[PDB]
Amino acid sequence: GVRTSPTGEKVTHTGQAYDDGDYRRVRFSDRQKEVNENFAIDLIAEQPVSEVGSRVISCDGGGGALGHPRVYINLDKETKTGTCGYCGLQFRQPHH
Amino acid sequence: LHHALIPHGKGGRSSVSGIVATVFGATGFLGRYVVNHLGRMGSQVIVPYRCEPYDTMHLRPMGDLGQIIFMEWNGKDKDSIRKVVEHSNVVINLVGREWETKNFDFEDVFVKIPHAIAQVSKEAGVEKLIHISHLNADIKSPSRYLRSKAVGEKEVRAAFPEATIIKPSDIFGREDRFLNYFASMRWFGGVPLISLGKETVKQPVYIVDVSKGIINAIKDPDAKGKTFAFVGPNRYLLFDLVQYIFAVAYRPFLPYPLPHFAYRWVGRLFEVSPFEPWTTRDKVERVHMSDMTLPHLPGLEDLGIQATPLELKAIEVLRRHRTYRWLTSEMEDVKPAKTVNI
Amino acid sequence: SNIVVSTRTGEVMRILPRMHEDINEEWISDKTRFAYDGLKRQRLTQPMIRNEKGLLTYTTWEDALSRVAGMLQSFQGNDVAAIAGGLVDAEALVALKDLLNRVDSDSLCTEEVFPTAGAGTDLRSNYLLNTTIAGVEEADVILLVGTNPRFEAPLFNARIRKSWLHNDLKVALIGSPVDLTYRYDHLGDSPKILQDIASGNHPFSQILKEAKKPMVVLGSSALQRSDGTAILAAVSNIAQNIRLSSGVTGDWKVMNILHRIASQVAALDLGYKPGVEAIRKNPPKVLFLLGADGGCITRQDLPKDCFIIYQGHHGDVGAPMADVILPGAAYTEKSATYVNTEGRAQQTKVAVTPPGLAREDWKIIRALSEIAGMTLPYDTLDQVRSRLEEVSPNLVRYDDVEGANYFQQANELSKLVNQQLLADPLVPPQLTIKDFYMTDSISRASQTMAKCVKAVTEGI
Amino acid sequence: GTSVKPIFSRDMNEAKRRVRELYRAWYREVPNTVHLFQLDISVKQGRDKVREMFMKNAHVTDPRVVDLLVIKGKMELEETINVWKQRTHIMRFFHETEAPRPTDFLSKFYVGHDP
Amino acid sequence: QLIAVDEKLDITTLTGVPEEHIKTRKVRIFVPARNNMQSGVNNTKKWKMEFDTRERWENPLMGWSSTADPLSNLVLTFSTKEDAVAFAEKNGWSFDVEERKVPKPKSKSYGANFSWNKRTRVSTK
Amino acid sequence: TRPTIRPRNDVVHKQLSAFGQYVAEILPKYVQQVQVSCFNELEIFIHPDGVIPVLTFLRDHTNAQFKSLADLTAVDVPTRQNRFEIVYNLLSLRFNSRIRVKTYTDELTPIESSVTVYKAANWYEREIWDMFGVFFANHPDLRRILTDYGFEGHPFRKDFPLSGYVELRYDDEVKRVVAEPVELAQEFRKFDLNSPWEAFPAYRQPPE
Amino acid sequence: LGLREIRIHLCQRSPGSQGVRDFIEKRYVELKKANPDLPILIRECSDVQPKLWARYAFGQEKNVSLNNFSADQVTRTLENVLSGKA
Numbered sequence A: 001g002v003r004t005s006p007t008g009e010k011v012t013h014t015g016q017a018y019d020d021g022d023y024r025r026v027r028f029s030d031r032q033k034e035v036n037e038n039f040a041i042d043l044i045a046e047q048p049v050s051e052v053g054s055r056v057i058s059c060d061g062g063g064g065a066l067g068h069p070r071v072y073i074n075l076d077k078e079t080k081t082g083t084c085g086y087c088g089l090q091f092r093q094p095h096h
Numbered sequence B: 001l002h003h004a005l006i007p008h009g010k011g012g013r014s015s016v017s018g019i020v021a022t023v024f025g026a027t028g029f030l031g032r033y034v035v036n037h038l039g040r041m042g043s044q045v046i047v048p049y050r051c052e053p054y055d056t057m058h059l060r061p062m063g064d065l066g067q068i069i070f071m072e073w074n075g076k077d078k079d080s081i082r083k084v085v086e087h088s089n090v091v092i093n094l095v096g097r098e099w100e101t102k103n104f105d106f107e108d109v110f111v112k113i114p115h116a117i118a119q120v121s122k123e124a125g126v127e128k129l130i131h132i133s134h135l136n137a138d139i140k141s142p143s144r145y146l147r148s149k150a151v152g153e154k155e156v157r158a159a160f161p162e163a164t165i166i167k168p169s170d171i172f173g174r175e176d177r178f179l180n181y182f183a184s185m186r187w188f189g190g191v192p193l194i195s196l197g198k199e200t201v202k203q204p205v206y207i208v209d210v211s212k213g214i215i216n217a218i219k220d221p222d223a224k225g226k227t228f229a230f231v232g233p234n235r236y237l238l239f240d241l242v243q244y245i246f247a248v249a250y251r252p253f254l255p256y257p258l259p260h261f262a263y264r265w266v267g268r269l270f271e272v273s274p275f276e277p278w279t280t281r282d283k284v285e286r287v288h289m290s291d292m293t294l295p296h297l298p299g300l301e302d303l304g305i306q307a308t309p310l311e312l313k314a315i316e317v318l319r320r321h322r323t324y325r326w327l328t329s330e331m332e333d334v335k336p337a338k339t340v341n342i
Numbered sequence C: 001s002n003i004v005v006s007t008r009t010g011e012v013m014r015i016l017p018r019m020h021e022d023i024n025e026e027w028i029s030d031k032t033r034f035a036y037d038g039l040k041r042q043r044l045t046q047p048m049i050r051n052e053k054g055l056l057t058y059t060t061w062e063d064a065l066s067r068v069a070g071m072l073q074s075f076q077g078n079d080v081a082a083i084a085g086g087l088v089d090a091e092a093l094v095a096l097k098d099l100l101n102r103v104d105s106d107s108l109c110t111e112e113v114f115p116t117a118g119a120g121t122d123l124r125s126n127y128l129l130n131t132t133i134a135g136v137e138e139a140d141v142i143l144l145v146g147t148n149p150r151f152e153a154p155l156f157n158a159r160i161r162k163s164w165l166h167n168d169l170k171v172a173l174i175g176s177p178v179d180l181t182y183r184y185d186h187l188g189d190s191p192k193i194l195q196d197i198a199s200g201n202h203p204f205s206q207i208l209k210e211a212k213k214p215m216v217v218l219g220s221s222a223l224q225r226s227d228g229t230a231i232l233a234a235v236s237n238i239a240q241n242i243r244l245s246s247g248v249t250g251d252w253k254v255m256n257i258l259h260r261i262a263s264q265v266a267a268l269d270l271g272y273k274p275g276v277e278a279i280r281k282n283p284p285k286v287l288f289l290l291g292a293d294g295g296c297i298t299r300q301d302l303p304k305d306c307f308i309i310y311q312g313h314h315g316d317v318g319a320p321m322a323d324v325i326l327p328g329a330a331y332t333e334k335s336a337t338y339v340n341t342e343g344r345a346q347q348t349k350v351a352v353t354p355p356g357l358a359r360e361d362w363k364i365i366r367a368l369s370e371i372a373g374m375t376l377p378y379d380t381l382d383q384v385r386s387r388l389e390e391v392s393p394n395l396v397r398y399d400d401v402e403g404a405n406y407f408q409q410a411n412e413l414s415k416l417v418n419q420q421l422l423a424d425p426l427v428p429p430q431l432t433i434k435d436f437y438m439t440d441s442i443s444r445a446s447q448t449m450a451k452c453v454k455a456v457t458e459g460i
Numbered sequence D: 001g002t003s004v005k006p007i008f009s010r011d012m013n014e015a016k017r018r019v020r021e022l023y024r025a026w027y028r029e030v031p032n033t034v035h036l037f038q039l040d041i042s043v044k045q046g047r048d049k050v051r052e053m054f055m056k057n058a059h060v061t062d063p064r065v066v067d068l069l070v071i072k073g074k075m076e077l078e079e080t081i082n083v084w085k086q087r088t089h090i091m092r093f094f095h096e097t098e099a100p101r102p103t104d105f106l107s108k109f110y111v112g113h114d115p
Numbered sequence E: 001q002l003i004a005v006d007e008k009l010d011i012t013t014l015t016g017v018p019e020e021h022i023k024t025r026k027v028r029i030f031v032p033a034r035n036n037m038q039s040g041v042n043n044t045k046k047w048k049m050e051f052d053t054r055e056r057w058e059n060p061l062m063g064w065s066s067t068a069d070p071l072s073n074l075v076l077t078f079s080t081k082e083d084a085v086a087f088a089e090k091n092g093w094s095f096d097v098e099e100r101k102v103p104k105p106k107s108k109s110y111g112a113n114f115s116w117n118k119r120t121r122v123s124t125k
Numbered sequence F: 001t002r003p004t005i006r007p008r009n010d011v012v013h014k015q016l017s018a019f020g021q022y023v024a025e026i027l028p029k030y031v032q033q034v035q036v037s038c039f040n041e042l043e044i045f046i047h048p049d050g051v052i053p054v055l056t057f058l059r060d061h062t063n064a065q066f067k068s069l070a071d072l073t074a075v076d077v078p079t080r081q082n083r084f085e086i087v088y089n090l091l092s093l094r095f096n097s098r099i100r101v102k103t104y105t106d107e108l109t110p111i112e113s114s115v116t117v118y119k120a121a122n123w124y125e126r127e128i129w130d131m132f133g134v135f136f137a138n139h140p141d142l143r144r145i146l147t148d149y150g151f152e153g154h155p156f157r158k159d160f161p162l163s164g165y166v167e168l169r170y171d172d173e174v175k176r177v178v179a180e181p182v183e184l185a186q187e188f189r190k191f192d193l194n195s196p197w198e199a200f201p202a203y204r205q206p207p208e
Numbered sequence G: 001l002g003l004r005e006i007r008i009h010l011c012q013r014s015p016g017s018q019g020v021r022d023f024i025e026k027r028y029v030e031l032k033k034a035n036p037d038l039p040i041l042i043r044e045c046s047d048v049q050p051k052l053w054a055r056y057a058f059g060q061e062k063n064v065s066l067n068n069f070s071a072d073q074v075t076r077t078l079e080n081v082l083s084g085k086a
């Protein structure tokens, strides 16, 4: 989800861009500004919400011991999905 | 004041001075001292260079990480100038040559390039411009170097009215072409002097004094549109000055008088070298010309600097020119030369 | 309240309580805890001067101080006045007082009004919480007049509830019937009740007479009203009736004043005039605003071409109308002395240095005095605190809460004049929780306080 | 009583005598240091600097502290005579690359927060 | 045989500390307050000496936090207040001493949770 | 208390306790305390005046024969009136044993040099003088060993800052290396690591 | 000559301030009624000694010790200060 500033400088995923009157931009002359193009927030936004038939789901991030510490997520609320505090994967009980 | 350019720290290497300076001519004699003084207090320095990058290496340790940025430029290309002055609040011009090459004459380096630098800096919004001229700049001078200097300072004032113009007189220092130039005249047996150097008065100024004067003029808000003359504290006859130089170097001094036409012939002969000439006709004319007296202009003491006399700093330049027998001789051993100070 | 400021890499991270058994125990209010983010917004970082057009523009310290010094040398006496805000420290207060005394000006005023009739600020115990916060634990009964202690002084209200819970304290309130988180006997909101109590024609008069350790607390907010003097006289008369009728218990203080302004007690100790009545009596040509953001005096209250100088840390109501802006240090950015409602002097410490070109406030005033030719005799913080000791010694005693009881003289002097009460119900400025979050320039700049106001105004 | 063990001197007189010996040694050594290290200062500058260093500690009134200061000065002189120090170490006494720090209140106020 | 001096101890000329960092510094001697996030009291036993906080600024490259005072991380530990005062005095540092804060003893009664006629009665457990 | 826990040695503990009692009996003029740690290490705390008589004894007595001086160092404890703890670690090859001798001094009190007992002490004492400022009387050649020429201060003192006071760089105006007050682009980040809960009840001090 | 403020620094329980305390208990009220528009700031000292400060026009001010004074001596001192004496 890259985006450009009024100066033409690419904005990073941290939302940091040099102002129009900032001298520090001179550091990029005759060179470039390193920017990572794979924005994690947009990438996790594309993952679908998993429908599971239990009130409590378990997530370890996939890969077993190659993931994150295994946590349990409550799915009682029907107004929102259950989000993993490590991975960002979303879960819900079937509704409608 | 643009918060990122608000001074912070104690004024040392890791501090922020608030100065962003583009230093044209930073790879020469005065340029290294100016860059060192800017980097001492934590300024951001931009160095436009046309030479080989190997020839800029000595400027790298002069600033903390990120504080000295090198960029290529072309003196005949205004886009390069715009590129190197886009983000600066100070532009210093130290570009100059003491001889003419096949690609750049005196008018190119002292009129056209300073004018382009001043005009581009004015367009780009640079707040402060420092331009270096000569004390003896004259539209009617017998030296075309000084005529070009006078024309160039006129054009710089025309294109950047708030410029600070600084006119030094014969800077001496470790890498100077003044003390080392007169000390390298021994390789020819005798010392040729027009009129035996008896009709020439010199007022040379220390290099560190000039660099500190440029720094202080940057820091002085009153120095905006003024013209300064940077001269030393003493005035000497050329004969006495050269004799003192040879005494400090402990070399035999054999001065003889050479007429103006013969010295001009010698200078033109040396002018044919495709490398850096040992001397030129213009150098011969400038060496044997008296320094002007300009009391109406402000000087180093108007910027808070007491001029360093030559007698305290001649040894740090001329010890290298001694034989092994005289290397350890101390500074106060030479009996300073006579001065004609009004 | 004693606090700990957590900093990391030159930035304030959070505020935590610091245990002090006699002031705040281990609790703080939510404004103390969460308003620190306002320190990161709307900050004054550079000196500013008016342009030819009339817009504020950055300048150096030299130029701004020179303009202020020229104006200071132009005028003298009543033509020069100063107003102190609610967040001012004692060092800057005394430096400004000395500077304006050098011009022969005594128009040193605060925004918070206190009655000058009678003893006025001559007797310290006249404007102090003489019982002290810990003394609430001891007292059997407490009467609150024209106050909403829950929002004006949350930790004092917490102490009241603690003694209500553990010592079965009886609480009565005269004023608007606010929720105090404990049950209290509401006598009404009419000021005349005070007189009805003082004459003995009230049941609560008898309740107070047979109390062993009675406590009368009058809110400084009640004092803001013009009759404030009549209210203070009535409260003092109630305390005198208690003193004479119920005998003498020893050393137990009945008369109390509860303050809401951090800078008020130090300013009263230093000799400032409470309120801006002096400035309205004799409008000045030169006006110093030292963190004053209450809007008490506007340019409509001053002669045209008046020279206004604002010194502070935030751009609030005060900064826009000034000719010259001098950026000062916030309370987290200096070591400075504050005196609380009890009369106890304490000092802050430097957590982070002031942003940009901002400087310590007393240093700004001392530099101004040097440029103006009337150099002040102190160069360091220790010397300014020695000057504070010369003016009011209790300011260098950094945990003392002891003091002489001068109630008899103050009551006798208050009996001199007989200003009338008004038929206006005592209505505190803080009526509900939404009024509590924003009461100063730091909390008005806080986005957390804005979120809190939005949350309490609409639930959802 | 104070029951304190001396280092070299019992009172201030012997400590002052040792100070004078060390001062004489440094004063004699200065011209040799100027010649051997190829310094650009004068002998008067070096001796003035030596005097300044000695004057820096004139306020000391404890004979043990004076003895330790003389011990340190003797160590520095021995380092200098044997050319264990280089030119950079000798010139470090003069602080030729440090900008002059203001002392009056106003300049310090302008430049920053340090008291 | 001993020499019987009669002057206060002063080692400033021997420590190699620059003049500025002797006469312009203010040390605080105090028992650190308990961190309010935890109930442990083991960090409130000893006395600490720390220096006054000086300026920190942003590094133009990397935006790191930069300092120029060498004593910004100097904290000394002492068994008593008198030891810290003596150490500060012999080093010539001006000091401010804050007295130790001990929590006052409290009367805890579980049965008071269920009082017949007092307000200490709890409405929930 | 099996595999995880380090095993004990009562035999060595008893032998070291007996030898410590022996040493204390032989030299009551100087010995102030004797201790045996639970990992079987013997310490003898002595008055400073006894540095030479004790060490010599431990070197020359037929039943001690501590011929090797393994190490000699100092410890700085600013809370003590006598700041500096002087530690001698000795090894006897004849009896295959080690011993530690401890004494104290302040900033202004010299300690007798032990070069006449152990020549190895020479450099060690220099290092102590370099790092802590402890002066050793009658040292043959006492001077800095580890620090730069002309260096001021004693870095290993607790009140000496970690980065010191001066740093070095090459300056081109003077064409040499110069020393200037230290400035750090990133300040060292102080960490507060101590848990507020007591770890070892066996070392609890009386609450005064 | 233009009197602006009076400051009385007395210590709460030191014997040397007894007379000053007597003054504040007995004659302060009448003094304040006689001079209603004159600030007379009563403050408390640590045990150094009692003091009386008088601040005049343009920031000039003088101090006089009241140690071991009686009520009469304090009254005399304040009478001289308030009038054209010294």
Ligand SMILES: NC(=O)C1=CN([C@@H]2O[C@H](COP(=O)(O)OP(=O)(O)OC[C@H]3O[C@@H](n4cnc5c(N)ncnc54)[C@H](OP(=O)(O)O)[C@@H]3O)[C@@H](O)[C@H]2O)C=CC1
Residues within 6 Å of the ligand: B024, B025, B026, B027, B028, B029, B030, B031, B049, B050, B051, B075, B093, B094, B095, B096, B097, B098, B104, B109, B132, B133, B134, B135, B167, B168, B169, B170, B171, B172, B178
């Ligand atoms: N030295 C003296 O005694 C006096 C000096 N001045 C003025 O001071 C200034 C500097 O003095 P100094 O430093 O001694 O002169 P130097 O020749 O030592 O420095 C010359 C600088 O100018 C640059 N330069 C020269 N010609 C060109 C060109 N055609 N295009 C681009 N860059 C060019 C050089 O770059 P490169 O290194 O790539 O050639 C070098 O950086 C000059 O303007 C001189 O006139 C004034 C009065 C007296």
Ligand SMILES: [Zn+2]
Residues within 6 Å of the ligand: A059, A060, A061, A068, A084, A085, A086, A087, A088, A089
């Ligand atoms: Zn997950």
